[PDB]
Amino acid sequence: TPITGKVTAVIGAIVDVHFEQSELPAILNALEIKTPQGKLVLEVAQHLGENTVRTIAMDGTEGLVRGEKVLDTGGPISVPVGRETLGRIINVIGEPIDERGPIKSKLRKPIHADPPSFAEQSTSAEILETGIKVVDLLAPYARGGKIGLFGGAGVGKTVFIQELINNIAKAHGGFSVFTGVGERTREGNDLYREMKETGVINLEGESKVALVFGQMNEPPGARARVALTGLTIAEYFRDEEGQDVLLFIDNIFRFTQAGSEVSALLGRIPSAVGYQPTLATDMGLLQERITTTKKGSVTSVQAVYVPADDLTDPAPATTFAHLDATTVLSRGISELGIYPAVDPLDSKSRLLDAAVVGQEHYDVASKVQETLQTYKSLQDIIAILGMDELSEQDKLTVERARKIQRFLSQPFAVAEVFTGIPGKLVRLKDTVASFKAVLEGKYDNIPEHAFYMVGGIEDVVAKAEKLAAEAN
Amino acid sequence: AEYFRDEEGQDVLLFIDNIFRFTQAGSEVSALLGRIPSAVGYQPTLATDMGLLQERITTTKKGSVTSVQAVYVPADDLTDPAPATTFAHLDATTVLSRGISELGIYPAVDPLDSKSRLLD
Amino acid sequence: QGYAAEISARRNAMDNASKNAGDMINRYSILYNRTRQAVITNELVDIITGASSLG
Amino acid sequence: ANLNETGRVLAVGDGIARVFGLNNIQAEELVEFSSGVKGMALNLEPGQVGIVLFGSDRLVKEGELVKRTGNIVDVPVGPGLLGRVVDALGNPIDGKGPIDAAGRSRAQVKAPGILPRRSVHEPVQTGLKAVDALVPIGRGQRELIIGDRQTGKTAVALDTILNQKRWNNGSDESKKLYCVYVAVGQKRSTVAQLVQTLEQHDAMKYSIIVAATASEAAPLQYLAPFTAASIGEWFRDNGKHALIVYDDLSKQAVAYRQLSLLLRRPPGREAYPGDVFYLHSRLLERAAKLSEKEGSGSLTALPVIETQGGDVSAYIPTNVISITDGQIFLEAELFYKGIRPAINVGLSVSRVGSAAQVKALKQVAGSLKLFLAQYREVAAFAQFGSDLDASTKQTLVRGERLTQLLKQNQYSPLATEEQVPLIYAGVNGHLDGIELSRIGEFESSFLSYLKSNHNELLTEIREKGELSKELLASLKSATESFVAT
Amino acid sequence: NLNETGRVLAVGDGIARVFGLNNIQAEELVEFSSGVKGMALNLEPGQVGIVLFGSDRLVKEGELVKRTGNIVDVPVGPGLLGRVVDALGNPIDGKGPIDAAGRSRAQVKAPGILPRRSVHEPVQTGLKAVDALVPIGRGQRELIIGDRQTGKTAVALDTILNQKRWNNGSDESKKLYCVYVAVGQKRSTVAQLVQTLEQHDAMKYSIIVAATASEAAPLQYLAPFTAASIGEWFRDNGKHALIVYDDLSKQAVAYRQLSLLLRRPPGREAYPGDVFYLHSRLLERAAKLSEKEGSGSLTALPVIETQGGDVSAYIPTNVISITDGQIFLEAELFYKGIRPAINVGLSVSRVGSAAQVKALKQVAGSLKLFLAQYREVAAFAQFGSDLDASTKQTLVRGERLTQLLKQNQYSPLATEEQVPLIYAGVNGHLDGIELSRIGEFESSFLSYLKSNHNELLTEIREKGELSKELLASLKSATESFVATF
Amino acid sequence: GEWFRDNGKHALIVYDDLSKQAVAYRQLSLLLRRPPGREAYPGDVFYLHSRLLERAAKLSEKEGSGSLTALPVIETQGGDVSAYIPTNVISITDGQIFLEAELFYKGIRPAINVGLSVSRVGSAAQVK
């Protein structure tokens, strides 16, 4: 006999369900409601008491009538897992949304699951070459590690990832899981085109990556669970298959944003800034599941949104602690025309150590920072007085610094439609020698413009020569 | 004023001094009612109230009403809601500087600050 | 003669400095507003949250 | 006394009403009171129901009668709305007789799925050179228009509408682009005069106007964008192209934060509720390019946001930027220096422009955006008076010429064919030699030179829309020869 | 019936309102039918508020509840050494049951006013910048405040590593056991930290308490208190302990969560009124005991996380007021090359020289005062004016002293190696050496003494002071080396 | 003081200080659970001082020519005249005698900032 109930209240994405029977479904369970359009899935949140429960809608609640019959599922929202998900677009609920038939999977695990034991934790210090100068030189990413891409609106968080997928997903060899949380529905479609053209996802053939979407257009309940859906699929290939997986998430912020919309209706006392009291935990349970274990390795590239360009915001500020590498983009750098707008100062990693990237690499990097730092500390003076007031030693460091900054920029193959310049992939080996050569003062004759949007160090001298013929 | 606009159809002038205390008034009223305070402390309903006064002042087919209301800038800040909202309806501004009347110029209207949205 | 050339340059130096520093003031003065308003709205939120406490 | 389709008012105030009854009502369902005022069941509780008031609470008395509509709030949609001015409900406010609607659509529609979509690739000439060169707009794109008070935010959207007349009067359909302006929180006169300008330019024939004045209740301003959206969605599904402009969304959120605060909701940043994002989110998503199976229709949106003191770091602004596919900031400073439109290339952006830009412009304008970005950095760094080298000085001379070339008067839309030539000269440097005060007269004199002489080039770029390796040479020899004289 | 049992009325968000339990105590441990334990914080006639240590998807309305009859306590004793336990004190490293000698409560009264001793015992941190400027003392609590990614943990970590110099010894009164308390950190990090301790054979005298973010809020809240009881143990048995909290900033966030959820009115920024009392009754628990008590002691190194360098914040100010000084760490100094980036200007020690080593006390007397003059001269030479002999002399030395203080992580330096370096600095033997030379100079000079003048190092070590004779030899050993090369 | 005013005389009343008064009133209002406004001051706080200062004036010849002068004292927090309470008072009064600690230290005592100190009545009430 199926357990059945009736609706008692419907406020926004929050519906209160009541059960006549004395058996109530636990928390985190699913529910379904019959509609002309299809079926509406609910998720238990808390037991208000009096055989009444509070649940979170997974889709629009328009049309719901009080006292309507509600059927119980008997288990937390589950989603198909296995190689059968690859080359298929799965919804937050766990159903195909690409119109290509149902995912005939072997097993179906729930989106809710407990984080790996402390004893199961495995640490690694292996470098991961991306080809990005400002990264492989300053804050290199680690294999099966956690990646974070902070930044305000329109700084370059996705475009940054797209490049990472154009350079790692291809020569990877394992599986990939892309999950768009609260993002432009359009970017998902164009992303689908790319996977097909590149051949990563072949309809007739096989694929190397699974697509899970909980776009912003979708209500808060979905924007809250989608992240869990995508993660369940990837933790499968981790333990069950024990194979390297690349977990791409964008954007992870929507996870807490979507939860702060309902926290109010749930009857929780708003913490400072409006965010729900349990920000640290929820965000905790998520990040703790996205990690490498003794069964498999997973490299996660999570993009984080920065509200009003404020890094002190509780949302992003609680994200840094869950990352082995942090690459922050300041809109103050992108506006300069410098891309990617990586901020060398704020950017940190755990691999920035001489016992890993080498002694020389450590020294060259440090010198670059100091130089950039000294330019920043005199910035106040520059706007007021100028360089005329700067000392001989200081004035030389500025120019050199400004040369290093411009050099940080790098043409992106994915962003060629913006820069009009063909992509430039630079190896870690050449990048180090490059800056080191600039520090030694072997290119103080070359104009700064020749460092702007340049790939290889050879291309600098090449571009410098081209500017001689253009001078009239 | 609207009476002489719709009845006698005249170009009546309505003087309000000062549009600022009108917003402050609302803020105290909405405060006592229990309504939750918006940004900067002003009332949420501020946006609608302002319109329930400015919109009523317009030129109809019968007559017209020109409003000449003073403006006070809270803490010399134009980012503030009250001023921000007020300027959204203003069409012209006649500034009166001390340095203008100081030169023996009457009225003390400042040519540089005085601007209009019908200067084309 | 080369003294008359220093005063002339120094008179230009401090002219642009007052213009940049001066114009810099009209920029931070705006940040002083948004930051003033932020403190007034934030302090107000705790007052409302402490009173909206029910069961 | 049927407590199933009708109920009694228990209390009223703050623009909310708690009615007792209506056990068979749907969530967010339209309703009507004894006075005739329309409401909406925004929330359902056991023993009572929350209804928002679309009119003044004066008309709502305690203890009145409340009937339900039985259908969610919807607005008349069809081709008969063209040339007609309506409000948030879809009723005529111009007085030209009732609206001829083909159908009725929900006020709250869900955005098209991920599968029934395609990347934008159809250019949308705005008439503005600086625009369709740096940050072009395509059929299905969502270009934001952010800027401070009186900066020319609508001036860019308005000219776009008037430039569409060049294709709306044609025979072909896929070339025509319908327009749907949305005015919320604005003045009566401001909209009335806005309409008049459309009639003078004879652009009202292909344009629909939706009104949500400030005098009108907040909720009207809240539902105005959503309904107005459904009006244009119609053209999309029929395989046609539409263009909707919100002016402005920033006020809406303010109107919504009102009902948000009145209903007692925990305040967020700047007193805006946490669900403020889902507001503009759900609205913009409904603007994209459908697949060929759907009808190859599209819906381009132009949301407008007003900032304070040139602060793009604000809350509302950033929330929109994280949804739209590029922004066109309008700094006030540049607006006073004459530089109009005051487009700040530094913050301007186009996430899908080159993809939906004419190849004729992609060739002549290469790395023009990045150059300008770096231009302001070296220009504002040499404004101290200090002496620089030849490298920085050379880039400083060419930057100034391009900046002045981007300038353009209002109500003066130029054909793509006319824009291509101007950009070419700027990058090459032919303008560099030219005096700075002669850049303006030069543009008007250069166009006449092509029409009077090399007209063939204009006709080629028009149809083809791309510059071959041969036409590229014929063009160079034609400009160089003019620069000398 | 219900005196020892109760039925759950509601449950969610880790909170459970159980009905009954009219003989349960305040802050008493309880057990549900599911197996999950809980803690009672709110005692009311109607119901009892309980917080869950685990997920709440297991508790349901009408479930049975049982009481423990005892206040939440944790196992204590030497057994824990080298083991990694959780809030409650259970093993999480997987190496057998915790063999404890006794069990002490979470909340313990701070030591008496009578049973105290003035701090006189040093705490070799191995960090020159620290042991020279802001010395640590057995019985005090030295704060480590700073922004994210600066080097807060570093300072603490190196300290534990430095203790290997005495813990491998036979003497007890000299050793110093270490208690790391991870709170809010991810299991990934904790795992790597414990890995590093083992790589230095520092895990044998180290106890770790894990309260990762994923765990329930009440665990993160209780973690520090239980962890303190663990360390207090040594303090009572006449041994020395060193506990490090990392970080109390997260703990308050956690404790804030229980309050809000238990529907307890918030103070400022949602933190509970008694948020101060959260850290006050924690830090006071560490202090130096009387000779009658055992001469035992407990040192504390609380860690705080500021935002944007704002020390004027709510939580940080609360702790700065309690701690016996603070080691401020600035991000900006880190890039400049000052590592660890300890801002002397703001970092102080209230115990002062009392805690510092006597030997090192002589060689650096007004050194901190001198570094103050350096920043005074360094800022004034910004003007770009020439400097006389005085202002340049101190500028030369002050610039090198700052370079001498720079020390690499994971590289603790004994006392016998710090004294010599500081000696050659405060005097002026480095003035005549290039800045990029100070680097290798340190290593070279040390290798020099360990080979030739090793007798002196042995006297400084044992004596711990400088005699009239030891200065003579030490003087000549320095000058002789300067002449070399 | 009004007594003197009504009977046709002259009375000077100095409120030292209104700042403390508002704090007291705020306390009552909060304890009584009335809506809290900016800085925890109820909406009627302005109605308080406005209904106090307006009591002092200059009666006409027919009324008795009596008069009541008011010198209210407000304590700012670091020169912040932009605060709530001060803004209310400054808006109602007819001039300020702004005082700065700095001017005090120099020696200028009483430290009356001529630049800010103003009087709307001015010469109207000053000996020729």
Ligand SMILES: Nc1ncnc2c1ncn2[C@@H]1O[C@H](COP(=O)(O)OP(=O)(O)OP(=O)(O)O)[C@@H](O)[C@H]1O
């Ligand atoms: N390219 C231009 N050249 C000269 N003047 C212009 C140009 N663009 C706009 N303007 C002028 O700026 C004035 C302000 O109107 P406009 O609508 O452009 O400002 P706005 O920022 O859109 O205001 P709102 O956002 O409130 O509608 C117009 O009346 C117009 O005359």
Ligand SMILES: Nc1ncnc2c1ncn2[C@@H]1O[C@H](COP(=O)(O)OP(=O)(O)OP(=O)(O)O)[C@@H](O)[C@H]1O
């Ligand atoms: N003495 C040092 N010299 C050079 N680098 C250091 C030193 N100490 C720490 N670092 C570097 O700083 C980075 C972060 O250091 P640390 O772990 O001390 O910061 P933290 O205060 O713990 O920040 P969080 O609390 O977020 O972990 C590490 O990558 C490390 O390599």
Ligand SMILES: Nc1ncnc2c1ncn2[C@@H]1O[C@H](COP(=O)(O)OP(=O)(O)O)[C@@H](O)[C@H]1O
């Ligand atoms: N490597 C890059 N080079 C140049 N521009 C970039 C780069 N990365 C991002 N951008 C800019 O960002 C815009 C797209 O924004 P996006 O990266 O999607 O921002 P978000 O992080 O908000 O998704 C493009 O118009 C592009 O100019």
Ligand SMILES: [Mg+2]
């Ligand atoms: Mg993005």
Ligand SMILES: [Mg+2]
């Ligand atoms: Mg506009």
Ligand SMILES: [Mg+2]
């Ligand atoms: Mg740390």
